[PDB]
Amino acid sequence: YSYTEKKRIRKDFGKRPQVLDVPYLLSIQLDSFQKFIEQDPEGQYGLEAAFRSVFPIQSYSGNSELQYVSYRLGEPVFDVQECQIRGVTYSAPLRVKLRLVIYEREAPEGTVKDIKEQEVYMGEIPLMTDNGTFVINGTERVIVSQLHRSPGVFFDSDKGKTHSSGKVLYNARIIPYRGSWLDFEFDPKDNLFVRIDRRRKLPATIILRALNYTTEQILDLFFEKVIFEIRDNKLQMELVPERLRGETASFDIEANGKVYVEKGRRITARHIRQLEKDDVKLIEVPVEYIAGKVVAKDYIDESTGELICAANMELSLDLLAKLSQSGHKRIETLFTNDLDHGPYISETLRVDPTNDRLSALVEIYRMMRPGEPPTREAAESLFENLFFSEDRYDLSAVGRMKFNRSLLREEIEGSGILSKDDIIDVMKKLIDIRNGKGEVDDIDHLGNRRIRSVGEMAENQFRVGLVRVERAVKERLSLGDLDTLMPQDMINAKPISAAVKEFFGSSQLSQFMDQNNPLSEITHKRRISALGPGGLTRERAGFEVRDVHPTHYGRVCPIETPEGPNIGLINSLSVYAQTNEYGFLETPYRKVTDGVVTDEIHYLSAIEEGNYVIAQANSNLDEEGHFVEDLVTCRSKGESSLFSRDQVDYMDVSTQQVVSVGASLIPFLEHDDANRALMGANMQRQAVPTLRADKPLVGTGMERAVAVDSGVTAVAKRGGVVQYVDASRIVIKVNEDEMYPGEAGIDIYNLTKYTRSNQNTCINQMPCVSLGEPVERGDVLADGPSTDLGELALGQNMRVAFMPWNGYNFEDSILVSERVVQEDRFTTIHIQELACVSRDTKLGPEEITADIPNVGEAALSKLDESGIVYIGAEVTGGDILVGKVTPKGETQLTPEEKLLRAIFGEKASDVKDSSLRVPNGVSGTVIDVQVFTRDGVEKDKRALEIEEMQLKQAKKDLSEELQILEAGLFSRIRAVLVAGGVEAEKLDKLPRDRWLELGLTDEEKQNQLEQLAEQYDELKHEFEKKLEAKRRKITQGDDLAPGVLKIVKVYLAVKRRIQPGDKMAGRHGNKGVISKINPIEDMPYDENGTPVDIVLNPLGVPSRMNIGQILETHLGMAAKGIGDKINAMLKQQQEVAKLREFIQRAYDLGADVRQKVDLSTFSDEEVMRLAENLRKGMPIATPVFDGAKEAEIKELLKLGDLPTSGQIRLYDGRTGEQFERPVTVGYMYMLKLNHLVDDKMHARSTGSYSLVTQQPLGGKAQFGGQRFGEMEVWALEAYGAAYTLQEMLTVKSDDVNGRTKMYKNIVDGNHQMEPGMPESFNVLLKEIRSLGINIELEDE
Amino acid sequence: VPLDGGRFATSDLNDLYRRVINRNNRLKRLLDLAAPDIIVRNEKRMLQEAVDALLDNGRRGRAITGSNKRPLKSLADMIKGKQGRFRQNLLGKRVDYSGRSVITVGPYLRLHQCGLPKKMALELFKPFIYGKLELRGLATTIKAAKKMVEREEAVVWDILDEVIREHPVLLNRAPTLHRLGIQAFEPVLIEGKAIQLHPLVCAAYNADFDGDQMAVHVPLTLEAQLEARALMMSTNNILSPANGEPIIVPSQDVVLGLYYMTRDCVNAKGEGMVLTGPKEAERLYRSGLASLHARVKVRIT
Amino acid sequence: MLQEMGREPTPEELAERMLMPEDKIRKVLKIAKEPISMETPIGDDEDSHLGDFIEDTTLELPLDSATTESLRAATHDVLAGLTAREAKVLRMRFGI
Amino acid sequence: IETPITANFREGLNVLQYFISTHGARKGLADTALKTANSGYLTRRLVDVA
Ligand SMILES: [Mg+2]
C-alpha cells in the first residue's frame, strides 16, 4: 500500500471487482477554458473561432482593409495572493498583432500601399487557477455552466388547441445559433402557414414565389402528373394499381375487355394484384371521371396565348369539350389519393393570392415594415439578410449536423446558411407526416439537448464587443485618411473590456464560490442549470422538464437537486458521464460479445443507447463465461426487461455511474428512502470544518479520491526527503532521478493560515508528517480544516443511543451531555472584517490620530500614537479602534445648553469625530490588520513601519530562499575542483572566498575560473533583480478612488461554542435541536458506569425510514470494540505476533472480498503507528450496494464478543435503578450547521426608521423592526383588539408625535395611548392629487 | 440623496418631469419661431407621449428605459400589485418593540408560561425601567440610567423582574392560517438563547422542533394588556370554531407512555391480590412487588 | 496615452503630458459619476430594492428629547432658587 | 408501473428500485411545494369578500 495507507487504512466490503479507477473530476471547465485560450490553427474554437468569423474587414467605400496576424498574452503582472490581499483581479495582458493592409484602388489591386504591421494591447483577461475559479477584486467566484436547447430543428404537434375540435395541428420549428427562428404550422383547414420569430401567419406558398418558383416547379415536386388522354372520343389513362388501394370504384372499372372491379366496389388487393399481374395500365374510363379533377398546368391555344384552363383550376365538361376543341388529348392533372396523396398544398395555394413573386416581396416588406414606403432593394436585401447573409444568421454547424440528420442527409456540415432544397424537403416532410407517417420527438430526450460551457459564451460576448467596435470601424475606415490612419488610431477597446467585465460580473451565473466544504465547492462546480438567455423561467417552465426522461440514466444523477422552485430545474452531473464534443453527452458502456462481456467500452450517446440492448453491473457473470441466468435484466427501446444471454450488445460498467457524489458517499442507501436521501446530501454540503479533523468510520471508498482534487492542499510533485519544517511552511530535497540537471531540485511549500471564505469562516493548513523521512510522489503534505491523511474529515464520530426521555426529546428533539463540551469538538471559530477610509472633504482632508475630544482614557489605553490598536488585545462593543476625525464647521445651541456651557466654561473646537468602534453585541481578539496609502500621499509613520516590516518579512524568506538554493549550487564550484588533485586542507581551514587563489592549471582550468566568475555574477544578479522588483511593489502605493486618501483595514477573531437552539443533524435528514445539555450524573448509564453521550426519541425512524442509520450504529458499536481490544493490548503491552494473528484474522474475515493484502510485507513500527491510529476504532468502507450484510456484522460482533442485539440494560442517573428493558446503542457520526441562533435572533426596542414613512426597518444588521402580515391582523379580527390594532398601526410604525408622547408616558410610568393618523395615508393623498384628482375629506 | 462615498441616488420620476420640461420648452421655444404644423404635431406627440409615460410607462406601447435597459416605474406602479401602499406598506407593517429567535421546549412548563432569553425583554422593557430608575433616583435621570445599565447591576434584574410580573406577551409564527396560529402568554426568564415552550401547541401551530423559529410582540397599553389576558389568553381558547374539537390532543408520547401504562398483560407478577387505594398501589409497585400493567383488585371511591 | 503606454496612465505622467497637475485631475474625478436610481434590486431576488435600506438621520430621537426636557426643567428648578433680578436677567439675557 | 417491489429497507433496494422510487417522490414533492400559492390566493379572496 501507499505509505499514507501504510499508516492508516479503511476496511472495505467490496466484492464486485471494479473496472475503473475513476477519472480526474475538475477536468471539465479547466479544459473548456483551455480551449478558449489555446491555439487552434484550423479547427478553430472560441477565441480563434470568433476572430476568423470576423476578420478581415473592408471599408464602407471598398478601398481599405485590415488583417489578422497572430495573438499572444503576457504573463500576468502580479502573482495570486497579492491580489487576494489588494482586492484585485488577476488576469493576463492581451496583445494581438495586426496588419493594416490597404490596396491601391489606383491600380486594380496595387498592394504597394499602407501596411502598419504593428501590434496592439487591448484588454486584460481573467485567468484561471489550477482549480478553475477566477478571483475578482479579492473575491473568489464561480461562473456556472448551462444547458439549453440546441439549434437545428424541432417538430411538434399540439393536440386539441381549440379542443372544441379535438384535432392535432402538426407544426415545426427551426432554430439557428444566431439569427432568426422560423415556424411552420397547420390549421384545422389543412393549410400550411409560416412565421419567423413569431411574426404573423403567412401561407407558406407566397414564399415559394418569393424564392423564384412556379406552380409548375412546385407541384411537379409535390404531386405526380395524372395524365388523361382522349383517344378520338374517349378518355383513357395509365393507372398504377396502387393508387386504387384502400379505395372504392366509381364506374365499372374494367379492362381492355375484362371487369376486375365493378361499380362501388373496393379495389381489393386481389384486383390491384391483377391489374399489376395482367399488366394493364391503359384503361377505358368514362370521360365524366375527370369532372372535378383539377388541371395540372396552364393550357392555352397556341393561336391565342389565352388560358382556357388555368393551373390549379377545377375541370368541367364545358371545359372538357372546349379544351378538346382547342386541341388537347394529354391532360396532366393532380393526383389526389387523399388517403395517401392529396390536398394540403393546393388548398393553401388557392388561399395564396400573390399571383407573383413581386407582390410577395411587397407584402413581406409591408407586414414587416407596416407603412407605405415600398421599394425593391429594401425587401430584397431584407429577405437576403434574414437567412442568407452570414452577418445576421448562423447555425452553429452543430445545428447543421442535427438538422441534416433530422433530414437524414450525410453531410454533417454546410454553412450557417440555408438552401432551398432543404426548405422544401422540410415542408414536404412536414406534409408527409401530416398524412400519418413518422412522428415528432420528445425534447426530454437528451439528444435534443446541448450544454453550454464557458468558451462558447465568452466567444459570444467577445464577438459582440468586436461588433460594437466594428460599427466605428466602418465609419472611420471609409472616411478618414488612408495613408496615415494607424490601425490602433481607430481602436477603442472599452466596449470589449466592458463586455468582458459585464459577463465577468453581471451574469446570473457569474456568482461567488460556495466555500464551506470541499463537497460544496466541487459540486457547485459540477452543477448544471438551464436558465438565463435562451433559457427558462420559474413561472413559465413546468413539470415535464422538471420530470425525468430515462435517458438521464448514467448521464445525470437524479438524486441531487435543491428543493423549492428550483427542484427539477437544477441538477448536477452523474459521475462517469462526459460530453459529446458538440456539447451533447455520453456515458461509457461495456460491450457484450457472445455472452462474454467485452472488457472494452464505448461512449454511447442518448440515441444509440436506445437502439442497443444494455446490461447492468449487479449482474452475475459465469466466471468469464457469460451472464449466468437465462433471463438477464437488460434494456433498449427506452425501457428494460429480461432477455437471453448472447443476445446482448452492451453492459453498464458499474452499479454507480447512474449517480453523483453526495448521494454516492452514503452507505446503506439501498436501505433508505429517497426524500430523506435528497435532503441528507443537500445538507451534507452545508458542512462545517470543526476545530480538528475527526474522521468517520463507515465509508464508501471514494472519499480518498475526493480529498485530493479539491486542490485544497499540497501534494508530492516529486518524491524526496523533508529538509525543513515550520509551523507555516516546509522545505524538501527532491530525489536525483526526479531532479533535472540545471535546476537545484528543491521545493518550498508555504502554508495557508487563518483566513476567510466568501461565507467567511476559518482557513488553515498543516502537515500530517514528520521530517528527515522519505516521500513518494503524488502523496500529500498537509491536511486541511476538514481533511485527514488525504481523506475528508468534516464531522465527529461518537456515540449514540435510542430512547425517549421526560419530554427532552419530544418531536424530532435531540439531547446531549456535557463532557462533549469539555472536549469542545463542536467548538469552532469565525472572524470579521472591519475597515475605514480617509477622505478629502469640502472643508479639508480628514485625518486619524489618537487625539479625540471628551474621552475616557480607558478606550485610549490600547491605541497607538497614530491612534490605533496594538495587536494581542481583546475588544467588545463600543470600544474604539481608530480615532478618525473630520474637519467640521460651526453651529449654535439653545439658551439652556448655553446656560450649561456658560458656568462649567465648556469650551470646544471646530472638528468632528468619525471614529471606528466595535459593533453592539460583539467581542473578540485583536490579531491582524493592514493599511493602504496612495503613491502620492505621505505614508503616515506606521504605514512606513509595517511597509518596512513587510520588507523585513518578505525579503527575509527570499533571503532564506537563496540562502538555501544558491547555496547548494556552489557544491559545483567546489566539487569540480576535486578532479586533478585537490588542496586537501589548504582548501578548508583558510577562507572559502580565497579558494580561487589556490592551485590552478592551464588549458581547461581557466574556463572553470570564468565559469566561477559567471556564476558569481549571475547568482548575485538574480537576487538584485528580485530585491528591486519586490521592494518596489511593496513600496508601490495605492491607486485610490478620487477623494480617497488612504485606507485601513482590520481583522479580529471570534470563537463560538455550543448552546441550545443550535441546530444539529447527521446523514439521513436526521435533524434536531438541543433543548438541554445534561450533567453527567443524571445521565443514564450502563452496568459498567460508562454512560451515554446522546439521547433521542426513536419514534420517527419508521415514518421516515432512515433505516441504514441503525445498521451504521451496529457496525460502529462493533468497530469501537476492536480499537478497545487493541487498547487493552498496549498498556498490558502484549507482543508483535499476537497483534499479527488477531489483526490478520481481523481484516481477513469477510465473505468474498475484492481487496487483498499481506502483512509480513510491512515492518513493526509501521504496524505500531498503524495500530496507534486504530486503537480508537476500526475504519470501514461500505460500498452502498456491494456492502456488507447482516451475517458478517453479527459475526464480527461475536468476535468483538458483544451481544448481537447490542441491546442492553441501563440504570438511570437519577434513580440508579434499572429502566424497564434493554436498549440499543452504538457509534454514529454527527454534524453541525451554519444555522446558529447567534446569527439569527434579534429584538428591536427603538431605532432606525424609514425616510418617507419613517417606519422601522427590517434586519438584525440594521436593528430592523419585524413585519406584521395581514394574516396576523386577521387573527385579531376574530379577536377584536381594537386598541392593540390601533397601537400597532400607529406608534409602533407611523405616528411620530404619538410614539414620542408614549415614550415619555412610559418613562413617566403612564401607560396612556395617543393616536394620530399614519403617514402613508396622506402620502397616498398627495399621490392621488398629483394625478389630477380631487380626493378630499368631509370633516365632521 | 448622496451616499457616504459621495455617491448620489434618485427616483425615476425626476427624469420624466425633467423630460417634459425641455419638450415644453422646445415647444414654446419653437412657438416663438413660426414653424410648419408638421413639426408641431411631432412635438405634441412627444409631449403627450411623455404624459402617458408618467401615468403608465408600458400601457399604450413599447415602454421607456434608461441605460438600465429596464422600464421606469410608473406613478401608477406605486399603488400597484402588492408593491403600492396597500399590500406592502399600509396593511402589513414593520413594528417597534418586537423580536424573534430560535425556539425549543419547556417540558416542565405550565400553560401561561414561556421561555424567554432575557436580553430580549431587557432591551424591550427599557422605559419602564427608566421611569422606574428616575422613580428610585438611583438613575436620577436617564443618561446615568443607561450608564448603570452598561454597568450591569443586580438591581436591574430584580427591577426587571419587578417590571415583568403580570406583563403578558405575544407569540407569533408564520404562515398564520387561523387565529390560533398566534397566542398570548406570560413571560418566564431563562439563562439561554433558545425559547422553551409547552410543546402541545405545535399541534395548533403545525410546528416542529426541526429548525423552526418565532417572533414576539408586546402589549404595552393596558387595553392590549387586558385584551391579551382575557381573550387570547389560552385558558379562554381551547377549541376550534370550526368544530367542537379539543385542539390540544396529547400529541405523540404522553399518549404512548400512558397506553403502555394502562395496560393489561397477564405476564409480569403479583396477580389476584387486593387493595385499599392507589396510594398503597404506588407503595406496592414501587417497592418492586408488582406490575403496573396487571388486572388485580382494588377499591375506588 | 493608453496606446502609448499600452496600459492605464497615471495621474502623474498624464498630468505632465496634459500639462497641468493632479489637483485638477482628481477635482475632475470627483465629478465623473451619475446617479443610480433608488429602486434598483441590490436585493438579487426581488426582495429588497436599494431604496428600502436607507434611514433618514435628520429628525431627532425621543430619548434625547426627554434628556433635554429634563435638563430644561432642572434648570427651571435651579433658577427657581435664585434672586428675582438674577434669574430675570439670566433668562431674558439668553432668551430662555 | 408493471413490476412491483420485492425488497424493503430491512433487505435493501436494487439500483433500479430506487431509481424508480425517485419519480413520484419528486412529483408529489413538487406538488407539496406548490399548493400553498393557490391556498393563500383563495383564502385571501375569501376574506376579500366577507
Ligand atoms: Mg417546522
Short mmCIF file of N, CA, C and O in Angstrom, two decimals, chain C residues 22-55:
data_model
loop_
_atom_site.label_atom_id
_atom_site.label_comp_id
_atom_site.label_asym_id
_atom_site.label_seq_id
_atom_site.Cartn_x
_atom_site.Cartn_y
_atom_site.Cartn_z
N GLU C 22 -2.17 67.03 -10.94
CA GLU C 22 -3.11 66.02 -10.47
C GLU C 22 -4.25 66.61 -9.65
O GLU C 22 -5.27 65.94 -9.44
N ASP C 23 -4.06 67.82 -9.13
CA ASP C 23 -5.13 68.56 -8.49
C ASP C 23 -6.40 68.55 -9.31
O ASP C 23 -7.43 68.03 -8.89
N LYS C 24 -6.31 69.10 -10.51
CA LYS C 24 -7.49 69.21 -11.35
C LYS C 24 -7.97 67.85 -11.80
O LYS C 24 -9.18 67.65 -11.95
N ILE C 25 -7.05 66.93 -12.04
CA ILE C 25 -7.39 65.55 -12.36
C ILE C 25 -8.38 65.01 -11.34
O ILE C 25 -9.46 64.51 -11.67
N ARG C 26 -7.98 65.08 -10.09
CA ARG C 26 -8.74 64.47 -9.04
C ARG C 26 -10.02 65.25 -8.80
O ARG C 26 -11.10 64.69 -8.63
N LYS C 27 -9.89 66.58 -8.87
CA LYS C 27 -11.01 67.51 -8.82
C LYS C 27 -12.04 67.20 -9.87
O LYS C 27 -13.21 67.59 -9.75
N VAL C 28 -11.59 66.68 -10.99
CA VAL C 28 -12.50 66.28 -12.04
C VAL C 28 -13.13 64.96 -11.67
O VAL C 28 -14.34 64.75 -11.78
N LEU C 29 -12.30 64.05 -11.21
CA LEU C 29 -12.72 62.69 -10.95
C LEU C 29 -13.72 62.60 -9.81
O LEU C 29 -14.38 61.56 -9.66
N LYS C 30 -13.85 63.65 -9.02
CA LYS C 30 -14.96 63.74 -8.09
C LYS C 30 -16.29 63.99 -8.80
O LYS C 30 -17.34 63.88 -8.16
N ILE C 31 -16.27 64.31 -10.09
CA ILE C 31 -17.46 64.76 -10.80
C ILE C 31 -18.01 63.64 -11.67
O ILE C 31 -19.21 63.60 -11.96
N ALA C 32 -17.14 62.72 -12.07
CA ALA C 32 -17.37 61.91 -13.27
C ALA C 32 -18.53 60.92 -13.16
O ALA C 32 -18.72 60.14 -14.10
N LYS C 33 -19.31 60.90 -12.08
CA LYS C 33 -20.33 59.89 -11.86
C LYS C 33 -21.73 60.48 -12.01
O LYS C 33 -21.93 61.69 -11.95
N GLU C 34 -22.69 59.58 -12.24
CA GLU C 34 -24.10 59.87 -12.42
C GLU C 34 -24.91 59.14 -11.34
O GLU C 34 -24.33 58.33 -10.61
N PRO C 35 -26.21 59.38 -11.19
CA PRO C 35 -26.96 58.70 -10.12
C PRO C 35 -27.42 57.31 -10.54
O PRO C 35 -27.37 56.94 -11.71
N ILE C 36 -27.84 56.53 -9.54
CA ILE C 36 -28.12 55.11 -9.72
C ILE C 36 -29.52 54.74 -9.19
O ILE C 36 -29.72 53.62 -8.70
N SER C 37 -30.48 55.67 -9.26
CA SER C 37 -31.89 55.29 -9.37
C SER C 37 -32.40 54.36 -8.29
O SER C 37 -32.41 53.14 -8.47
N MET C 38 -32.79 54.95 -7.16
CA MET C 38 -33.20 54.31 -5.92
C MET C 38 -33.72 52.89 -5.98
O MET C 38 -33.37 52.05 -5.15
N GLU C 39 -34.57 52.61 -6.96
CA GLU C 39 -35.42 51.42 -6.95
C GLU C 39 -34.74 50.18 -7.52
O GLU C 39 -35.43 49.21 -7.83
N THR C 40 -33.42 50.20 -7.69
CA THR C 40 -32.75 49.06 -8.31
C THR C 40 -32.72 47.87 -7.34
O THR C 40 -32.66 48.06 -6.12
N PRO C 41 -32.74 46.61 -7.85
CA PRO C 41 -32.65 45.43 -6.97
C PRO C 41 -31.22 45.04 -6.58
O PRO C 41 -30.60 44.16 -7.18
N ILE C 42 -30.68 45.71 -5.57
CA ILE C 42 -29.48 45.16 -4.95
C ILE C 42 -29.87 43.93 -4.14
O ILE C 42 -29.01 43.08 -3.86
N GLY C 43 -31.14 43.81 -3.78
CA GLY C 43 -31.71 42.51 -3.48
C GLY C 43 -31.83 41.71 -4.75
O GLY C 43 -32.68 42.01 -5.60
N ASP C 44 -31.00 40.67 -4.90
CA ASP C 44 -30.91 39.96 -6.18
C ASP C 44 -32.22 39.27 -6.50
O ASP C 44 -32.84 39.54 -7.54
N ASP C 45 -32.67 38.36 -5.64
CA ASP C 45 -34.08 38.04 -5.64
C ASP C 45 -34.84 39.32 -5.35
O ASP C 45 -34.37 40.19 -4.60
N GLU C 46 -36.02 39.46 -5.95
CA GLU C 46 -36.77 40.71 -5.87
C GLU C 46 -37.30 40.84 -4.45
O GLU C 46 -38.50 40.73 -4.18
N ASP C 47 -36.38 41.11 -3.53
CA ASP C 47 -36.60 41.03 -2.10
C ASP C 47 -36.32 42.35 -1.41
O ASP C 47 -37.07 42.74 -0.50
N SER C 48 -35.27 43.05 -1.81
CA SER C 48 -35.00 44.37 -1.27
C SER C 48 -34.33 45.18 -2.36
O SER C 48 -33.14 45.00 -2.64
N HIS C 49 -35.10 46.06 -2.99
CA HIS C 49 -34.54 47.09 -3.83
C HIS C 49 -33.90 48.17 -2.96
O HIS C 49 -34.32 48.38 -1.82
N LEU C 50 -32.89 48.84 -3.52
CA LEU C 50 -31.95 49.61 -2.72
C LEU C 50 -32.64 50.67 -1.88
O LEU C 50 -32.23 50.92 -0.73
N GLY C 51 -33.70 51.27 -2.40
CA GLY C 51 -34.39 52.33 -1.69
C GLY C 51 -34.86 51.94 -0.30
O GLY C 51 -35.03 52.79 0.57
N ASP C 52 -35.07 50.64 -0.07
CA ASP C 52 -35.61 50.18 1.20
C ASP C 52 -34.57 50.16 2.32
O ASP C 52 -34.94 49.95 3.47
N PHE C 53 -33.28 50.33 2.01
CA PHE C 53 -32.27 50.20 3.05
C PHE C 53 -32.14 51.46 3.90
O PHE C 53 -31.90 51.37 5.11
N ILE C 54 -32.29 52.64 3.30
CA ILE C 54 -31.84 53.87 3.95
C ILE C 54 -32.74 54.27 5.10
O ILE C 54 -33.97 54.11 5.06
N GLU C 55 -32.11 54.81 6.14
CA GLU C 55 -32.75 55.56 7.21
C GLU C 55 -32.52 57.05 7.00
O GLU C 55 -31.47 57.47 6.53
#
